Design a protein around this nucleic acid. Structure first.
Lengths: 81, 150, 155, 129, 144
RNA sequence: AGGAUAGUGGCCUACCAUGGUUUCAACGGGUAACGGGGAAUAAGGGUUCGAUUCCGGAGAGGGAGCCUGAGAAACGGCUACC
RNA sequence: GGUCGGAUUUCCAACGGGGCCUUUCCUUCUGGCUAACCUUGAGUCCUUGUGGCUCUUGGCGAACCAGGACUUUUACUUUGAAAAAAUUAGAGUGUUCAAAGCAGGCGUAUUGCUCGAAUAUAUUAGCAUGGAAUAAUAGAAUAGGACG
RNA sequence: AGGGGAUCGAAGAUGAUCAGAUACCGUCGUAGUCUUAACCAUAAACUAUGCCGACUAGGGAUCGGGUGGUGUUUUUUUAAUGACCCACUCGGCACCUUACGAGAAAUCAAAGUCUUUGGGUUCUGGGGGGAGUAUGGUCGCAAGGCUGAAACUUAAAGGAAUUG
């Protein structure tokens, strides 16, 4: 140390740092495209949904909120971004 | 931090650097506004409107996708409340604490929390009066607070 | 104003040595005396058109503006034809190289040609003694927005 | 609460200099900070610094050179006369030949010798030597 | 930090705080209260005349064993009786009793000097003559 | 509004209103306080004093009153008590 | 450079300024001394580096005096005047030196000339004046908004 | 003031001890100890370290939360889960080493960024006594609490560490 590059740090360092302590702070949460087996509808959900989102057709459960990332139901498929 | 506590947590929300995002959102901004309006007429506050929008839809930050903030859109569409959302929730919490104290007289801890909550209400009410969001000489009376929250 | 019994007192009120001769009838039918305050101030339209008497007005009265011109915020409008302003200022204490807030409440006569509320800023001009504590008179109301009509409950 | 962001910047800069770091990070990077850094940069007490433009307040990364003995703020920003500039330099500076007092005057944030040339004065900000 | 206000508009607070803490200085307190004017054998005056009432011998404090040969005298101007020390070899015979003497302080502004308890003044002149001149026989004491 | 003054002015009189000052210290108490120019000490910042040769004020034992007079509530002017 | 380390210059280095341009404020008629002339019917000869170019027909005059289709408020800071005199800092001045004082000095004493008696500081308040960094204050949000 | 009143126990009774013991010790023992409705508002109420904010050092733990896993696990011996292991992270009770710094030292990650002295702010102190007394005010039913001197007296009092 004692001579560092605060302007171009390693993405490994940026991966392990807190979201609010990076060089420029931004979210690490993402979004998911979700398919329920009942219908062919595609629905966007937030990774930290914190609410029990429901499909338009199968309007019972699509993801389950938790303290952090929402826990998707075992009867569905997801795709990042 | 924690103006009425000793905590020093951060636990904030770090919105992205992008101010025109997320480059995969296809719904029209007019569809978003009517989505907001029907939610307001359904009877939701701006905070819970935003989270419901952010989850059941792809709208990351409605201020980014639309041209106006949530509360600004409701006010421009004639759906703003008489008292702001955060002030209304503070008065709601104070009424709950006072209602508890009416029968649990010996709860000196609830008495302490009531003073802290009420002093929080008066500080917030001072800000809304000096910015003219509330009318002047608007006062939290602790006797008509039940009617304010219903 | 023009209404509400301008002549309500026990004695007739009208400014000295103006001949309102009831013989000839001109188009205006009445002679009203006014003037300009000088030093860039203007006589208000309400003073030229006014019906009040107010022998202490800088325009429709016998007082003249000379000496200090001051300004301040209005704090009290509870007494007739005069108000009190607050002239806040900073006083320098040399030993600490710092300042302390000080104020002086200045009682000032206000003409009915002007309409003021608590909180507005007015400019006043020195004249001869009017009463025991009055040595200034309102000459210009510097109210632009008013900060009073924006705090009403909305609909 | 943060009340003097310039004090936070200079304190972090001085602390990094004392421990011998070649670089330092600064937040929230006011333009008073940036102008203060520019005056130091011209006189050679620091090197290149880069402004990180996040959308909130900005950050600064300053490359130090070890030639800075101290930089500090004089809070509150006292009003200083032309004749009082000499008094502030005799107190705040270690020698008459070098060092500066940073003034914010109507002509811009400027040091005391350059302000002497312009015959202008303002409120004191700090010192560097 | 420093525990005191710093802002440009904190002049009033700094004045008031310093004014309150001036009352801890003993010089400032005595001067402001007029203690020497009000409660003091002299009226803030360096010298004062006294009429002798009795000659008394105070034993010197530890660790010195001796007799100090002082006199209890009464003040003409304010009616206060105080004790004054008679500094020299002898000079107890040049005070007699019921004489007129001149009194001045020891020089410790109170705080009875040395090992002589309960005395804050000393005799400079007696019967209108310097005690030093009488000690060296430069003059003569008056018969009155 | 009137009287009084040389004149503005609750200066005073009569009528009417309930006002005016204050924690940014009103009001009250003390001052062994006449104010200023200034004196001592003084690296800077400051501490204390200023009854006293210049300016301003007040008084001629303390009050009150008044004539003469441009100008006095005079005092080496007058009227009254103590 | 005939000018014994000695007494510079529109070739200029850096300083402290002003004006103009780049989307850049100076709100607006009232009258003319004809904008630091964006007009050369005519024309002033210093015999070929480059700053001493005449009577100029007008031709769009903010570098100017009050009627207002003229006013965000300060704090701060620069400059200017006033801040009695004496005292203080200080120039001149053999009271024999000195404290001092504001005098004195010079002719051939033929019957006379002359210098002075400066200067600076003297805060905080008030008045103009240049600046718009720092610090505070206000505006168009149900437009009761500006522009003709 | 009412209720409760097992135990222990200011007062007290009492057996010892002692030169005397109305102290330590032993046997009991009233008020208290508990509760309700009101008082009081003081503790070495202590980390003898005000609150907020930034930076400055090297570790292994641990509490709560979240994220990830060429991970384990009893169930389906290859599903959530839950419990563990490993790696980060935020906030917390703290620890160990070293002080580059600070301090008079003990020692301190703050008691550091301090004559190279200014991030914001509140409170407190000016040698020891007299004295937390007098007096005045205020609160309490009292006990007492808060505020709070002076006269006078004195060359020391006190902190940390060394040797005996």
């Amino acid at each position: 140390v004692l001579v560092q590059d605060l302007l171009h740090p390693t993405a490994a360092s940026e991966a392990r740092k807190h979201k609010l302590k990076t060089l420029v702070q931004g979210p690490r949460s993402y979004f998911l495209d979700v398919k329920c087996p009942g219908c062919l509808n595609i629905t966007t959900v937030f990774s930290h949904a914190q609410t029990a989102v429901t499909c338009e057709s199968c309007s019972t459960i699509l993801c389950t909120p938790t303290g952090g990332k929402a826990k998707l139901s075992e009867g569905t498929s997801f795709r990042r971004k | 931090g924690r103006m009425h506590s000793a905590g020093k947590g951060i636990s904030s929300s770090a919105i992205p650097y992008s101010r025109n995002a997320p480059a995969w959102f296809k719904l029209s901004s007019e569809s978003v506004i009517e989505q907001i309006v029907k939610y307001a007429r359904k009877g939701l506050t701006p905070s819970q409107i935003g989270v419901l929008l952010r989850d059941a839809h792809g709208v990351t930050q409605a201020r980014v996708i639309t041209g106006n903030k949530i509360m600004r859109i409701l006010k421009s569409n004639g759906l703003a409340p008489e008292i702001p959302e955060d002030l209304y929730y503070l008065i709601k919490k104070a009424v709950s604490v006072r209602k508890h104290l009416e029968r649990n007289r010996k709860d000196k801890d609830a008495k302490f929390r009531l003073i802290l909550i009420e002093s929080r209400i008066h500080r917030l009410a001072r800000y809304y009066r000096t910015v003219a969001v509330l009318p002047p000489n608007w006062k939290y009376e602790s006797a008509t607070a039940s009617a304010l929250v219903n | 104003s023009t209404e509400l019994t301008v002549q309500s007192e026990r004695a007739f009120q009208k400014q000295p040595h103006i001949f309102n001769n009831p013989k000839v009838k001109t188009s205006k039918r009445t002679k009203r005396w006014y003037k300009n305050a000088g030093l860039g101030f203007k006589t208000p339209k309400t003073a030229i058109e006014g019906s009040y008497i107010d022998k202490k007005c800088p325009f429709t009265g016998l007082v003249s503006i000379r000496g200090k011109i001051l300004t301040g915020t209005v704090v009290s409008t509870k007494m007739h034809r005069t108000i009190v302003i607050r002239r806040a200022y900073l006083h320098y204490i040399p030993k600490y190289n710092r300042y302390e807030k000080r104020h002086k409440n200045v009682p000032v006569h206000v003409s009915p040609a002007f309409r003021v509320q608590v909180g507005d800023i007015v400019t006043v001009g020195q004249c001869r003694p009017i009463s025991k504590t009055v040595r200034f008179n309102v000459v210009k109301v510097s109210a632009a927005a008013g900060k009073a009509n924006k705090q009403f409950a909305k609909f | 609460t943060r009340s003097s962001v310039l004090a936070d910047a200079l304190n972090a800069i001085n602390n990094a200099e004392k421990t011998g770091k070649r670089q330092v990070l600064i937040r929230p990077s006011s333009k008073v900070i940036i102008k203060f850094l520019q005056v130091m940069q011209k006189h050679g007490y620091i090197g290149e610094f880069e402004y990180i433009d996040d959308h909130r307040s900005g950050k600064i990364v300053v490359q130090l050179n070890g030639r800075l003995n101290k930089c500090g703020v004089i809070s509150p920003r006292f009003n200083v006369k032309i004749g009082d500039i000499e008094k502030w330099t005799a107190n705040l500076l270690p020698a008459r030949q070098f060092g500066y007092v940073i003034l914010t005057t109507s002509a811009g944030i400027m040091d005391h010798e350059e302000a002497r040339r312009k015959h202008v004065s303002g409120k004191i900000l700090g010192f560097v030597y | 930090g420093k525990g005191k206000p710093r802002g440009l508009n904190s002049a009033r607070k700094l004045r008031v705080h310093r004014r309150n803490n001036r009352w801890a200085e003993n010089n400032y307190k005595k001067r402001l209260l007029g203690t020497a004017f009000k409660s003091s054998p002299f009226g803030g005056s360096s010298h004062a005349k006294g009429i002798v009432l009795e000659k008394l011998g105070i034993e010197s404090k530890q660790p010195n064993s001796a007799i100090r040969k002082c006199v209890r005298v009464q003040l003409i101007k304010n009616g206060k009786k105080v004790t004054a020390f008679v500094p020299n070899d002898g000079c107890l015979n040049f005070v007699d009793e019921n004489d007129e003497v001149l009194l001045a302080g020891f020089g410790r502004k109170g705080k009875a000097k040395g090992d002589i308890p309960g005395v804050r003044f000393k005799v400079v002149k007696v019967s209108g003559v310097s005690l030093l001149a009488l000690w060296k026989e430069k003059k003569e004491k008056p018969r009155s």
